[PDB]
Paper text:
The large superfamily of labdane-related diterpenoids is defined by the cyclization of linear geranylgeranyl pyrophosphate (GGPP), catalyzed by copalyl diphosphate synthases (CPSs) to form the basic decalin core, the copalyl diphosphates (CPPs). Here, we used X-ray crystallography and cryo-EM methods to describe different oligomeric structures of a [name] from [name] ([name]), and provided a cryo-EM structure of OsCyc1D367A mutant in complex with the substrate GGPP. The structure of monomer [name] consists of an αβγ domain and a catalytic center located between the β and γ domains. [name] catalyzes GGPP to form syn-CPP, in which new bonds form between C6 and C11, as well as between C10 and C15.
To elucidate the oligomer states and the interaction mode of [name], we determined the cryo-EM structure of [name] and finally solved three [name] structures in dimer, tetramer and hexamer forms, at a resolution of 7.9 Å, 3.5 Å and 3.7 Å, respectively. The dimer is composed of protomer A and protomer B, and the dimerization interface involves their α domains. The interactions in the dimer assembly of protomers/chains A and B occur symmetrically in α domain helices α22, α23, α24 and α25. Residues S674 and E677 are both located in the original dimer interface and form hydrogen bonds. The S674A/E677A mutant form exhibited the highest relative enzyme activity, comparable to that of WT, and showed a lagging peak position in the size exclusion chromatograph, indicating that S674A/E677A is present in a state of lower oligomerization.
Numbering used by the authors:
A (entry chain A), B (entry chain B): 80 to 767
The structure:
C-alpha cells in the first residue's frame, strides 16, 4: 500500500534535471561528428552500439506501443544513413532496407493534423544529404514532391535579416536551413550555450568547428546519458510544473507538501519580470506555462502579479508564439480559462477580456470534433472542458473533478508529440492511477459506514416529525456537502459534527416555515443540543452560539432579510470548536481580519438568497444576472483574504470559511435532477 | 467649585425616607386627637406651637413665594378652628379673623383647572364641623353653594359596597365621607398600617379608638418630625426615582454612580410583578412611575420586562388611575412617549400601540394652549415636547437636550401641587442649576481652545486643496459630531483623534468623487497617516486599518454599494486604539459578539445611504418611508446588544459603537439650515 508512496517520495525527492524518452534520429545527427582532436572515425561508439542493438524484430525503429509511419520513416532511415558514412555492420543496413524500400509509400494516408515540427523542412534535408550517399529509394512518389513544394514555399516567406533577430522554432529546426551566416548566430544563443536546446542545430557546421562554449552541452548530454539522446534538453521547469499540476489534480500530494514547496520555491526564485520558458535560463517565453505557473504559485500561497501577460495582445487575439501568429491549440488557452477565474480587485482587466475571448473561442470546439491538441494526443480533453465550462472555481468541488479525472488519465496509452514520438516517465508514470484509485476507494469505504451510522443516530433521535416529507434525500445531500468538502481521515470529528449541526438547524428552520416563525413558538428549542454526542467543550460552546442563532431568529421576525449568513456562521463556529481551533489574539489584526471575514460571509450569503426565490420564478433577467455578477465581484475579495498568506492566521481556519461558502455556492447553481446522480457517480459505484 | 459636589454627595449618601414641605392643614386634623390614656387636653403641644409661631406678618397661612387663595383659605382657617376647640391664644384667632372675615370672597375667580384633591369634598366637611363651633363667616356667597352642589353630586355617584373594594383616592380623601362602616375598612389598609399614607383619614373615628396598628404611623410622623406634618408619607420610591431622573437629565451624576447604583438596587429589589407605587409596600399601582422606572432601570443596565403594562388597556385608552377613567395629564403619558422608543425584538407590541395612541393624543396640545399639568405647575414643558416629538432616542444628543433644559429648570420658582401647596428640597434643590451651569461652562471653555488648535493644525497641513469649497462649515460640524458625542475631560485623546481621522477620510473621499474613483488613482495616499500626531501604537495600528479602508475602496470600484460602513468601522477601530482598548479574547463569545456588532454597523450604515440620495430627490414616498422603518427595526437590536449587560464585554467599548451610529443618524435627519444654529446654541453664546 505505502510502497507506491515510497516510490513516488524517492522519485520527487530525487527531482532531477530531465527525464525524456531517448530519441534515435538526433543520435545520428550528432554521430556524424568527426573526432575533434585529429582522430580517425566517429566521436562516440556507445551511441552507435545503442543504435544497432535497439531495432525491432521486424526491423522498424521508434516506439513499439504505437504505429505512425510518418515519423517511423525518419527513425528507420536516419539510423542507417550513418552506417553508410562509416561502413559498419552491413547486417541491419540491408535488413532494414528490405523494410523501407517496399514500405516507404504510405505518406499521403496518415492524417491532416499529425505533421511533425517542420516535417517538410528536415525530411528533404535528410534525403538531401542522403542523395550524395549510396542510396536507392523509390524516389518517384507524388506524395513527396507535394511536400517539397511547401518546403520551397516556406524557405522564401521567412525573412533574411530579421530572421537573425528572433530566437524561435526556425532556430530550433535548422536542418532544412542552408547557407546560414554565423556572424550573428553566436550572440543570440542559449544562456548555457546551446542552439535552442538542440544539438542538430549545432551539427550543421559544428562538424569541424568544435566551439566548446557550445560543445560542453553536447558532451554532457553524451557522457551522462550513456546510450542514445533526445533532441531538446534541459526542461526542468517544463517537467517540474507539469508534474505538480497533474499530481495536485490527483489529490494525494498532501503527503508531499515538503517537496511541493521545494519545487514551488525553485519556480519562484526562477521567476522573470518578462515570462517563462521550458527551462531555467531560456529567454524565449510563451503564454501557456507562464500562465499555469502564475496560477499554481498563487494557488499554494505565493506573491504573484499577472500584468506581464500583456505581451500577447494582437488586436484582441492571443497566441502561444511570441510575435508569431499561428493557430494555437486547445490546451494552451484552456489553461488560461482555468487561470482566469480567481480575479482580485487589484488585478488588471486583461484576464476578463481574455476570458470572454477564449470562452467563445473554445465554444466552437465545444460541440465540434476539433477538440484535439496540436502537439499532443489526449485521452479525454472533452471530458476536461465538459467540467471547466459549466463549473467555475466558485463551485468546483475538488473531489468530483478527481472522480472525473480517473477516466481521463491514460498514461502509457498516450504518447506525447514533439519533434519525434516520445513519452515521459516522471509524471507520465503508471502507478499514479493505482495510488489515486486505492486512496479514493478507502475514502469511499470510510464514508460508506459513516453515513450508515449517521442514519441510525438520526432515526433514533425523533427528528423526523420535525423537517418534512422525505428524510433520505436530505440526509444524503447533507452528508455530501460535508464529505465532498472535507475528505481527510484525521478530521472525522468535524465530519460528523457538520452533518448533525446542519441537520438540527434545518429541522427547526423547516418548523419555523410551518407554524409561521418565532412569535408562534410553542416549545423551548435551546435544549435540543443535548442529544448530539457529548464532549468536554464541544457541547457548551456549541449551545451558546446556538442561542446566538436563535437570537437572530427572533431578531428579524419583522424583517425581509434571509437566514443564510446566520446558519453559515453557525456552521463555521461549530467547526472552530469541532477542531479545537483557537488563536492568540494578542494582535489587533486578528479580530480586524476575522471580523471582515465573517462580515463578507453574511454579506454574500444574504445577497444570494434574494436570487434563490427570484430564480425559482424568473420574474426578471437583468435583475437575476445582476445578482450573480454582484455576488462574484466580491466573492473575489472573499477568496482573496481567505487565500492570502500575508496574514498571521492559521491557514486551516482561514480556508474552512471558503469551504462552506463554496458548498452553498455549488448547491445554488446545481438543480436537484443535476445533483442527484452526483452522489451515485462519486460513492455508489466503486472503481476497480 | 467642588463645594456643591460635597453638598450633593452628602445629600445623596444620606438618601432618607422622606423630605416634604411641612403642611399646616392636616396638622390641625391630627391636633384634634384627644389624649389616649385618659389625659386632659391635646396629645402634642409642639405642633400647636409650630402652629402659632408660623403665621405671616399679614396673618395669612401657607407659602410666601406664591399667592393662591383657593388653598390659602383652608390653610388660614383650619389652623384657627383648633384654638376654638381648645380655647388657647386668642391673639391670632381674631388677628386672623380680620383677614378671613373680609377676604373670604375670591373663590369664583381663581382658575378653571387649579382645583385641589376633592376641594369640594373636605371644604364642606371643614365648615361642616366648624358649623357647631363659635364661627361667624360670610355664609352667603353664591360661589360656595355652587360647590356644595357638586359635593351632593359626587356623594351619590360613588358606590356603596364596591366602594369598600378599591384602595383609591376616595380612601385618600375621607374627610367628606360620613357614616363609614369600619368592618371592611381595616383589611384593605396600608401594609405598614396607614390609611392611604394619610392621617386625616384615620382621624375620622381615630379620635377615640387608638388602634396602635395604625397609631405608630401617626406617632412616628409626630415625634421625629418635631413641629408640623404633611399629609402623605412615605414616598421613598416617588422622591428617589424622581431625583435620579432629573439628575441624569443634568449630566453631572457621573461623579455619583455609586449612590446611583444604590438607589437603582433599592428600586430593583423593590420590583413587583404587578406594578409600583409612591412607596415601598403600597399595593395601589399606577402607570406613570412604573413606566419611567422600567425605563431608567433598563437605561442603566438591568433586567426588565414590560408585559405588566397591559393593565391600562381600556378599549385602546390608557389612564393613570387603576380601573378609573379620569382625564389624564400631559406628563403621565409624555413619560411613556419617552419610554416607548427603545423597543427590543422580544418585546410586546403594546409599546407600539401605546406610541401611536399617545403621539396623536398629545398632538392635540402640540399647538393648543392645553400644555399644562393637572397636578403640578411647570416652567416649560412645551420646551420638553418641542424636543421629544421631533427627536427620537435614535438621534438624541445627550448634551443639546441638557443645553435646552437649562432654560427649563425653575426650582424655587415653581411649586408642586398635592392636596395642598408644597415643595420638595431634595431634588427640587436650587444649586443643581449652579452646578450644571458651571460644569457645562467649563466644558465650553475647553472645546473653545480645542477647535482653535485643530484649525491651526489643519490649515498648516495642506489639506485644503483636498476636500472642497468651504473648510469652515466642515471643520465645525466634524468637531461637533465628536464633542457633542464625547464630552468628558479625560478622553481628549479620543476627542482629538476622531476629528482628524474623520477629516482625512472625508478629504480623500471628496478627492475620489472628483477624479472618478480608485482606478484613476495618481498618488499613494497610504503615507498621509504621517502628519497626524505621532505616538507609540497610535500610528501603526492606525495605518493598517487605514489600508483596510483603502482595500475596500478598491474592492467596490465596480459595485453600487456605499461607503458608510467602512468609514464607520474605521472610526471605531480608531477609537479602540485611541483609548488603549483591548480585551482578553480567551472566550469565543468575545469575537462572537464583536463580529455581529460591526456586522450590524455596516448593515445599517449602508441601508441608510440608499435613502440619503433618494431623499435628496424624493422620487418615491413608500420606498423612503420603508427605508426608515427598516433602519429602526434593526437599530433596535443594535442598541440592544450595545446596551445589555449579559455580556462579559467592557461597557465603554460596547457603547462607543452606538456613539457614532447615533452621530450619523442625527446628521441624517437634520438638514443644514436645521443643524447650523445648533452649534451657536450649544457653544457660541455662554450661560451666565
Amino acid at each position: 500500500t505505502t510502497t507506491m508512496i515510497d516510490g513516488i517520495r524517492t522519485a520527487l525527492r530525487s527531482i532531477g534535471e530531465g527525464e525524456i524518452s531517448i530519441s534515435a534520429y538526433d543520435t545520428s545527427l550528432v554521430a556524424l561528428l568527426k573526432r575533434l582532436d585529429g582522430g580517425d572515425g566517429p566521436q562516440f561508439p556507445s551511441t552507435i552500439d545503442w543504435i544497432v542493438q535497439n531495432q525491432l524484430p521486424d526491423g522498424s525503429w521508434g516506439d513499439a506501443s504505437f504505429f505512425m509511419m510518418g515519423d517511423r520513416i525518419m527513425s528507420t532511415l536516419a539510423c542507417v544513413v550513418a552506417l553508410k558514412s562509416w561502413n559498419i555492420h552491413t547486417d541491419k543496413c540491408e535488413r532494414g532496407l528490405l523494410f523501407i524500400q517496399e514500405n516507404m509509400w504510405r505518406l499521403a494516408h496518415e492524417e491532416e493534423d499529425w505533421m511533425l515540427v517542420g516535417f517538410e523542412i528536415a525530411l528533404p534535408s535528410l534525403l538531401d544529404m542522403a542523395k550524395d550517399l549510396d542510396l536507392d529509394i523509390p524516389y518517384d512518389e507524388p506524395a513527396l514532391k507535394a511536400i517539397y513544394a511547401e518546403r520551397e514555399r516556406k524557405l522564401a516567406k521567412i525573412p533574411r535579416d530579421v530572421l537573425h533577430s528572433m530566437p524561435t522554432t526556425l532556430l530550433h529546426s535548422l536542418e532544412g536551413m542552408v547557407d546560414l551566416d554565423w556572424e550573428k548566430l553566436l550572440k543570440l544563443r542559449c544562456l548555457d550555450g546551446s542552439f535552442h536546446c538542440s544539438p542538430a542545430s549545432t551539427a550543421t557546421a559544428f562538424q569541424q568547428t568544435g566551439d566548446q562554449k557550445c560543445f560542453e552541452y553536447l558532451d554532457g548530454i553524451v557522457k551522462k546519458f550513456n546510450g542514445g539522446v533526445p533532441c531538446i534538453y534541459p526542461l526542468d521547469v517544463y517537467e517540474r510544473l507539469w508534474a505538480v499540476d497533474r499530481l495536485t489534480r490527483l489529490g494525494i500530494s498532501r503527503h508531499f507538501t515538503s517537496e511541493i514547496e521545494d519545487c514551488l520555491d525553485y519556480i519562484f526564485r526562477n521567476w522573470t519580470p518578462d515570462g517563462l520558458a521550458h527551462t531555467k535560463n531560456c529567454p524565449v517565453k510563451d503564454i501557456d506555462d507562464t500562465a499555469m505557473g502564475f496560477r499554481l504559485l498563487r494557488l499554494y500561497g505565493y506573491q504573484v502579479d499577472p500584468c506581464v501577460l500583456k505581451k500577447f495582445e494582437k488586436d484582441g487575439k492571443f497566441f502561444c508564439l511570441h510575435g508569431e501568429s499561428n493557430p494555437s491549440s486547445v490546451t494552451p488557452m484552456y489553461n488560461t480559462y482555468r487561470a482566469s477565474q480567481l480575479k482580485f480587485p487589484g488585478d488588471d482587466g486583461v484576464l476578463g477580456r481574455a476570458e470572454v475571448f477564449c470562452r467563445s473561442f473554445l465554444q466552437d470546439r465545444r460541440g465540434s470534433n476539433r477538440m484535439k491538441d496540436k502537439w499532443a494526443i489526449a485521452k479525454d480533453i472533452p471530458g476536461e472542458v465538459e467540467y471547466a465550462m459549466d463549473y467555475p472555481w466558485k463551485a468546483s468541488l475538488p473531489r468530483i473533478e478527481t472522480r472525473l479525472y480517473l477516466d481521463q488519465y491514460g498514461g502509457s496509452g498516450d504518447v506525447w508529440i514533439g519533434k519525434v514520438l516520445h513519452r515521459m516517465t516522471l509524471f507520465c508514470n503508471d502507478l499514479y492511477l493505482k495510488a489515486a484509485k486505492a486512496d479514493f476507494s478507502n475514502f469511499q469505504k470510510e464514508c460508506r459506514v459513516e453515513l450508515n451510522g449517521l442514519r441510525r443516530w438520526y432515526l433514533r433521535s425523533n427528528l423526523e416529525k420535525f423537517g418534512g416529507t422525505d428524510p433520505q434525500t436530505t440526509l444524503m445531500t447533507s452528508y455530501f456537502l460535508a464529505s465532498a468538502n472535507i475528505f481527510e481521515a484525521n478530521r472525522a470529528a468535524e465530519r460528523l459534527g457538520w452533518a448533525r449541526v446542519a441537520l438540527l438547524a434545518d429541522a427547526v428552520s423547516s418548523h419555523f416555515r410551518r407554524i409561521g416563525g418565532p412569535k408562534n413558538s410553542t416549545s423551548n428549542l435551546e435544549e435540543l443540543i443535548s442529544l448530539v454526542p457529548f464532549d468536554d467543550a464541544y457541547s457548551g460552546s456549541l449551545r451558546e452560539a446556538w442561542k446566538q442563532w436563535l437570537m437572530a431568529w427572533t431578531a428579524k421576525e419583522s424583517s425581509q432579510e434571509s437566514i443564510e449568513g446566520d446558519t453559515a456562521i453557525l456552521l463555521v463556529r461549530a467547526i472552530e470548536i469541532f477542531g479545537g481551533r483557537h488563536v492568540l489574539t494578542g494582535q489587533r489584526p486578528d479580530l480586524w481580519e476575522y471580523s471582515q471575514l465573517e462580515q463578507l460571509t453574511s454579506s454574500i450569503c444574504c445577497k444570494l438568497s434574494r436570487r434563490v426565490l427570484a430564480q425559482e420564478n424568473g420574474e426578471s433577467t437583468e435583475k437575476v444576472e445582476e445578482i450573480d455578477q454582484q455576488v462574484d465581484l466580491e466573492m473575489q475579495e472573499l477568496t482573496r483574504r481567505v487565500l492570502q498568506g500575508c496574514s498571521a492566521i492559521n491557514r486551516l481556519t482561514r480556508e474552512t470559511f471558503l469551504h462552506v461558502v463554496k458548498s452553498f455556492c455549488y448547491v445554488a447553481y446545481c438543480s436537484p435532477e443535476t445533483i442527484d446522480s452526483h452522489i451515485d457517480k462519486v460513492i455508489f459505484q466503486d472503481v476497480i
